[PDB]
Symmetry: D3
């Protein structure tokens, strides 16, 4: 049965990920380990959060998410293990993933285990949670953990025990909500008739530009598909296009497309060409949209 | 038991491949998903084709190849699913892969699913095909596909249904041969006694240079192992060596080797040193060979 | 539930690794193939050695390590397959990986198969071995091996037979110890009271700097945690810090940490910042430490 | 007090320019040699033309302009020496450089000597000429000219004779107008109401962007200072600002200024910040402007 | 007689400097124009200041310094022309430049003309001044100055009139001290027994590192030649060497030298090797020195 | 009348060259200072030598060459001043430079002043010398020279005294031939019928490749214009062309030209395209030529 989906900042150029995987198979012989990605900017908890927030709906119920960037490795800190509530960001207008009308996922069906450093901020915000525990029991972590490798000791190892059916509530004491570290999410400001945000990510390998201006932020301004937009990046680049569902709607190869990405965020790209790379556009640059 | 071998342009820096994998495991619980590669130049159909053309003889019979670069994502286009004819000859490369005399593969034993954009051109050229269908049935694709993610909606998802035993002929209507998009492959030309082609790829991470001039094109010119060759690249950057089976035949480390790569194409390298990188050699550069 | 742990210099940008995996599943249908890494500097046998030496204690007993950089591909050379003795770097007390007191591994529980080019030098040094054989039998390698792809022919293929239960002693004749190629490891020398070694690796993606100076070399010079050290790199760039167990011990983000890495070697880093990248520090640079 | 103003593509990293200067002082002992620049893109005759076209009005009457990029060096080609007619780009009213109302320059007061390769195209277009001669006399060029250094042999040397008072008409035979090589200057075209030109130069070291769109092209489309413009570069990157006389008119540091450069062409910049460098803007990129 | 020494941010890749020089020769036919440098970081008034502060002692009395970075070009601002008082930074213990005991320079013997933007801050601080005037008279600037080229209109042109003997006090009205724009010079902090400053410049082309910690700051701490220093750059690099007069005092090529540069500022270098380049050290990095 | 031609490693990015010039004009009021170049690789005596060896025949008789890279600055070393013998033959290059039959220069007509570090090795080799003196007299150098600026103190300053007519023999004691430091010049070797040398320089800004294989070395091998040559660079990167007088003889733009440069050395280029830059060719690479 069991699946662990594994996301880290460990990279793919040495044996760090393999050591974690070896231990997952040692503990839970029948496990399937699925890599999410291992390439996140080291120590960038906000970036790590983006790669793990929308996973549950895509995976079978009972999947465990081992998600780790651990700059506090070797300190007295301990990981948090949480059972999430709802698999969607939606649920009302479902938008389940899969063929047909998609695969509906039951509530309380996924566990995340992570450093208690805010990595799970958006997971908890979008999904809610039913229970959360500090990971302390020597049944699921080493008695003598390697100081420089808590991703392995405090995330990979216990994730496999959880996958093998170790009761969640036995990993350690319950954590009160305020004991779960969170980062602040800069809010999209409803300025004038415009919405002012940032570039949240460059979408590699395509060089598409993703903003933190969500479809729900747009709905709030009556902005829908077909609306002629001005999207200004870095303060000085007033891109102009209608909001369209996809890249090819821009027509000629290389033409600008303003669109909603697969997370429902306002994005901008060229049609089958890279927008970000030629002009060295970067995450953190300002993004303003108006109709 | 069932395997899906997965090749895309999605990269390995975010959760895109993982969303596809989650759904593959959801649809076909027993499946093994094997990554081919996810690093191809985005939208480069010809490059993608080289990563998938010679896979079948390496894989167990019944393997499904989910192969996708999807620049027409979100348009009315639909994927093609094809059952190939021969696993080897035309893509023999000796003949069968494996220990002893190799593993003979029965005809009609492999399915590819891909955008209908020419990605399968060389697969069909080298292997032939027995049947081909448009992928349209809501039993195997979403009713509301994400406009910007047809790699997931129109390839990953239906590949998993096929792996799970969904009948190939039920995915949609049969496609006539002319309805399968193909790209043109530039021909190897004869100019005097010399064969003129191009650098087809730089072989990373080694910096070996691979041309589109084939063993069969050399055999047609009376050229075999031992022949003293002059291989000019970029019109001006020439090289001279005998055609040898392997790198070490060049003698000293760094010496030039002209050889046949594992696909039987005329190639050039330095012995345990990078040829392409120090001189910034690139794909698309002209390549002329003469005896 | 057989496992093959697979380390190569083949990269992950083409189908080379996938060809190997396909053949592994062909030969041993119930196998799990775990990637160690495929990104090592091509032909660098010393670097490859570092990624494979400490794997056994993390993996279930019976795991086969297919480990290959093969610059002598297509020559009369043949691979070596060895069953190692001790899984840990320790004798009694062991230092075992996993939850609780870790998971002890029985002696003789792991097989490595590799080119006979010195890649296994440190594996043999740290673990010892019980038996070693030349890999020559056409039951486990191709009768007509592709000259430029011995990593596939002479490592991937036979590793899958071994995973499948093919008897190790039947792959070919026993090799005497002197017939197993070794590289020499450069000694940490003494310059008065200063220890003199090299930078053995830049620890990507973090930019931590690992030296070949071991805890044991430090102890003989009178150094444990808390000792004020001067660490000079490249005979130019000086750093000073106490030896601490981990990064956050340095205090402020960006502060210098001098520590022992997860393999017990003297290393240097910035706390949650890259040391190596801004100063363009590289492997092979001299490293001198003194109390 | 003769002056030679000297512009070449010879660079300033070796002794090439110094060899030319030595010979200038040898031939015309009282000369002052003024460097224009020596950094032009080698062999780019259009670029060289831009650095020399507006020089005469700044210089004392009788100045000789030695201007040379000479890719046809060592061929049977010979230089052209011309006495220009009008010093300014203007007729009556002139637009003279200097303090007060500027310094008027008499007609026929300046000589250019250059390869006959089109380098003087715009000088002749903007200034007209009174007389033109092929440079062939052994009184003013070497009898045995260095084949790879015609910039020295056929430009520097004869320019110094001319500065010294050698009669222009004696350097060789008169050239008819059709015998003076010209390049064609690409026309600013019309796309509806938008003007369409190119980026003619990146203005180093500031990263300002100069277009080939002239004030006169703008006037015919109904545009003077204060006009709100949309300027699109490279068919991708859009900017919007009023046309202003100078950089600081943009307000804040970093703000976009669209202005007319000191040669009267439509240009774009950031105020006391580089525009071109962060976005990697280059010469030859399309430039479209509309009111 | 007259000399103009010319320093600007105009670069040496186009005709901007030449246009200024042409006009200088037009106005003052007997002038010698000496380039200081034209390569300063555009708009960086503090950097420009460093290239012009120590010039007077090296030049004949009566020399005019035309010094210009003019980001306020085209505004209502006007240049300042000042007669400096003392040619030295010293005078007491002379340290005149030249052979023998050097060339003593009379007081009031040099004029600077510059934008009134703080470029002359250090000139006025180190030398004092006797008179200062706003440059407004149409006898010495154009009646219709080119908006984008005040370096030419408001500095080069009037500098030549001044060189030709135009009375300084006739350029325009006297400026009161408070009307002369100045920048703040971050002070070297006498912390503990240490002195905390910054890297003021990387000394190209050598890659030596210059600090703003002056010889007089060192004298204040009893630091002289022979003192064993710890110089920490960027917070984390405790360089250690005695203060020595020159590079070769460090011994072996590549060894660290801590020294006083030719302006009397604490500097650090390698002996006949670049310190700054290999480790990408930069201006603005912190610099702390202690004995 | 008097000229100083000035070559250094001081660069053109700060006021170092200008301080030298100021003093030259102070000491010798009538002087003209001609820049050779200031861009040489710092401390590279062999490179500096190439920029100064062939200057004399270009300059008026009585010219002083102030040539300095001074890594031993601030040591007890003292400069050497030498009067050379022959201006040309041995450095003829045809013979005399200039119009007609060129300008014959009398023997003993040029003085070089330089660090005694081998910078003048090839000057003395090609021109011979009549007298040489150590530069020690306080009449021509400072009594208290700046330790880090001997380029100024021990070259610039005394060069100006020499230009001003200070007797050469009064600068200090005569130096015996053995007291003049020389560097070793690697010899062009014969290997079979082929001549083996090195790339002596990349000819910036063109990317031409210059070797140390001379016209005389070719003339000794029976090689003249028209000879079909094979020129291999970096041991592996070979090229084939006839020896031609100039670039355009190669025909099409971009075609390979093998030719003799203006110093008579075997060189290779592309016709009006850069050879060195696209392929990252560098000085010090091996160069072998055969007919
Ligand atoms: N230099 C570092 N500073 C802080 N944390 C680091 C550093 N290098 C690696 N790490 C963290 O170690 C964890 C291993 F468990 C990884 O997740 C890194 O974030
Ligand atoms: N900017 C883009 N233009 C056209 N297609 C794109 C672009 N960015 C991503 N894609 C395609 O989306 C598919 C997801 F399924 C990927 O295969 C990309 O080819
Ligand atoms: N250019 C090369 N020289 C020597 N060995 C090479 C070269 N390119 C690839 N290889 C080796 O081929 C093996 C394939 F099995 C890889 O492991 C490479 O080390
Ligand atoms: N983009 C610019 N913003 C502000 N000033 C600039 C810009 N580009 C050039 N300049 C200034 O123009 C002056 C010419 F007189 C130069 O000194 C530049 O500083
Ligand atoms: N870091 C340096 N080591 C040795 N010599 C140097 C260094 N930096 C500059 N110089 C020499 O100082 C001379 C000034 F006259 C220059 O010619 C440099 O060669
Ligand atoms: N490789 C070259 N091809 C054509 N012309 C060249 C090349 N290298 C230098 N030159 C020209 O030589 C002239 C010397 F007078 C320079 O102006 C270059 O344009």
């Amino acid at each position: 049965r069991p699946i662990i989906a594994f996301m880290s900042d460990l990279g793919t150029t040495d044996d760090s990920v393999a050591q974690c995987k070896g231990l997952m198979y040692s503990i839970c012989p029948d496990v399937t380990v699925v890599d999410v990605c291992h390439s996140m900017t080291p120590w960038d908890v906000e970036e790590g959060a983006r790669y793990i927030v929308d996973l549950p709906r895509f995976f079978p119920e009972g999947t465990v998410f081992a998600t780790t960037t651990y700059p506090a490795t070797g300190t007295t800190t301990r990981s948090v293990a949480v059972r999430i509530k709802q698999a969607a960001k939606g649920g009302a207008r479902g938008q389940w993933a899969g063929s047909g009308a998609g695969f509906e996922r039951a509530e309380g069906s996924y566990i995340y285990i992570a450093p208690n450093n805010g990595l799970l901020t958006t997971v908890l915000e979008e999904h809610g949670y039913l229970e959360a525990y500090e990971v302390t029991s020597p049944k699921v972590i080493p008695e003598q953990p390697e100081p420089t490798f808590y991703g392995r000791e405090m995330v990979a190892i216990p994730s496999a025990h959880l996958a093998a059916g170790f009761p969640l509530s036995e990993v350690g004491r319950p954590l009160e909500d305020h004991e779960i570290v969170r980062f602040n999410r800069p809010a999209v400001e409803q300025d004038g008739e415009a919405l002012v945000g940032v570039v949240s990510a460059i979408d590699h390998p395509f060089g598409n530009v993703w903003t933190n201006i969500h479809r729900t932020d747009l709905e709030k301004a009556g902005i829908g598909y077909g609306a002629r937009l001005r999207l200004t990046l870095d303060g000085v680049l007033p891109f102009e296009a209608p909001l369209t569902p996809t890249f090819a709607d821009a027509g000629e190869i290389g033409n600008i497309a303003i669109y909603l990405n697969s997370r429902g965020y306002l994005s901008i790209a060229r049609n089958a060409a890279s927008l970000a790379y030629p002009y060295h556009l970067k995450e953190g640059m300002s993004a303003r949209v108006e109709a």
